[PDB]
Amino acid sequence: MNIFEMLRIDEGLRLKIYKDTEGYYTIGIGHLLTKSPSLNAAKSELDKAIGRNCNGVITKDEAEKLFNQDVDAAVRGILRNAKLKPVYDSLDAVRRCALINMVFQMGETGVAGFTNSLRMLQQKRWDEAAVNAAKSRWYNQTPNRAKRVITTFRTGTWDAYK
Template sequence: MDLKNRLISYEGSIAYQTKVGYFKNGKFCTYKDSLGYPTIGYGRLLKPGESYPNGITPEQAERMLEEDISTAKSAVRSLGLNLPADWQDFMTIMVFQLGLSGTLKFRKMIQALRDKNYKEAILQAKDSLWYRQTKSRVDQMIAELTNN
């Protein structure tokens, strides 16, 4: 599954969001994420003052997701790691979820990736509040890794 579809799966497909009431009348509605932050579409965290009282269309949600993936990929590149494709995707999803500042807190994991010690990087990812809060997602992300 490509990166975009993996994120749609992790953040909630239209079918899932319809079931939980975040997708109604052909539009995505704002909802609070697991930490209470206003979110819309496929995991777009709303900035202060940003609001979509009438919701957004699936096309708008896809465009936002593509922008957010591009932003996350740029942030991963800024880390200066020479990563294989599977780890680039892992880190892009991590930055998508935690932001660059949250990802930078994983100093030991980032060092393990610099050292190409993928087993240690996985151990460091699992030794975190992020893992405890989103165990299923991180386990799925780890399962996609071929360099481990």
């Protein structure tokens, strides 16, 4: 396991424009296209990210490419974020994957708001960090996924994903 296999499980793969759990237009492996309700807006953005007239469908490769760029960005955002970098850096490898997953899902700003769990993760207070993070709208909205990510922070193993 690694970040790619992990997110590929949590986000799935779809080659046609679909709506995410929030109702937004997305494609491939969790690649958000727009928060706009217009499918036209969705299609334009897609043609732009792909660089061709897709007609709302891409190939697997195109999806894979977008995903690579998306992880890269997520990591780089972490690294650039003064509240995030320190946590990330104090973490072992499995746990970092959990941190990238959340950033991938809710953006750095979203993650950066878990002030208290972040501090607890930094102190290696796993159980505590896990109980704090479950008190979130993130957890109540996508409970299955949140549980797998939280267990990963708690145990530092991939069990939740086997």
